[PDB]
Amino acid sequence: AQYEDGKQYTTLEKPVAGAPQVLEFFSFFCPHCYQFEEVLHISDNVKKKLPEGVKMTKYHVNFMGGDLGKDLTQAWAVAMALGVEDKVTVPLFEGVQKTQTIRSASDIRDVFINAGIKGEEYDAAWNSFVVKSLVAQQEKAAADVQLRGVPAMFVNGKYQLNPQGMDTSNMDVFVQQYADTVKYLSEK
Template sequence: MVLHGKVIKLLITILMVGLSSAAYSKDYQAGKNFTVIHSTVKQPPPLVEFFSFYCGPCYAFAERINVDTAIRKRLPDDMKLEKYHVSQMGPLGPALTEAWAVAQYAGVDGKVEKLLFEGLQVKRDIKTAADIVMVFNQLGITSEKYAEMQSNFMVKALIARQDNLVEK
């Protein structure tokens, strides 16, 4: 009886091995079993980092640990890191998202990031939207120029993109 059970197990094992190898040996044909895509990905999508100027760990990652720099060093040359501000955090969240979009548009995002983080996390002297504009004034961007950039189509599109991606 025990021998009979062992023989059945052996036969089942041999049968399973035979069936599985038959599946592996099948010849697949292009156009019949699969489609060949001849185009290549021209540019990979960006790596997106979400952050808030109100977030203490975000401040530590950006200013103390330099996580962004470490990530950028390891990315392929054709891939970039995009940073999007989360509007939902803090009383000035939407104004800070707008400021971040203006900073990116003006090409001063690295400088503005440091000043906004310090103003909100360390000095705690940014309390109003006017205080945010003062940060740009420190960098030589007048209040008038800031207001002009706020109404720019590209800045508005960047704000919408940030908000839409945060909601996803």
Template sequence: MRKIIIFIFGMFLSSKIYSCQFIENKDYNVINNKVEYMPKITKFFSFLCPYCYQEEIKFHINDLLQKKMKEKYMINKYHVNFLGNELGKNLTHMWCIAQLLGIENKILLPMFEGVQKYHTINNKEKIKQLFIKVTGIGEKDYDKLWNSFSVKMLMEKEEKSLKDTKIQNIPTMVIKGKYIINNYEIKANSINEFIEKYYSLIKFLIKK
């Protein structure tokens, strides 16, 4: 759990005069070797991370950001393997299936709740059962996708992204495969103010 950044509960504690000028090594860090193949906006998270759960389910940070960005920019969510040993790897595997089918939003809440609220998701078979229940996909189709080359390649790509960016903390947003946003530096008195500042920083880094 040392690899999880605690920022959700502190981001509303204080405010500061907002400026459009953001500071390197404070508001964001720069990756030495830009990861060219990554999407413009990549969010690293885990279903096993309590702060990711708070961000997604309680504060709806990513939904609010995506709504703010509309379709101009899309947040691509990559699940990490460094939490939960085998369970974490199986959750990553499942998430890649959801990505391939384009149903990430359909499975996100049920899987988070199964893992962290109800504690019913604790092995590969339980992951499969919930996925089938929520999405309506057949068991044979799920198994076929689980063993498919396409899912395997997607997993390898996302694992490589994690390795190349050297991300060790979650939740973490990476812009253009080059800039890592320091969430805990975004101070605000409300969710709306936080979203405005977060969005401004994303736009700044995209244009940088």
């Protein structure tokens, strides 16, 4: 074919029922995630090519960055609850990986404050049980799909993007290829 299992994607031998349609995993400690977000804008270009009706879900993972990794998963939960994902993603990436000014929960919190969320609202969210189950969801979703590496994308709990089998000589071409693959798997 032109799209072959084992080349632009792999198939989960233990499919996952009820799974979000498009499910993406990242870590603010993950260097290719930094690239995927700031340089390539993968999420963004995929959305651009999804059919109508398709919801896009993105989760953080715990297995990078030790104690600060979990803090970042909780904070991502806060971002999801407050709907401020688009205002914290970049400063969180640049704080962990570029400037190295995020060394504790307290520094994560500063990013939110400077992004305009208020202390009282953040601290409230941070400690809320809605955020706890949001954290649990992130963890369950990773758990359901063997997950040990990021960035990672799953379509309908059955197909997993395999970006290693696509050309990277041209980053625009890498992205379109990736996005078109997601569309193909979407329609499958």
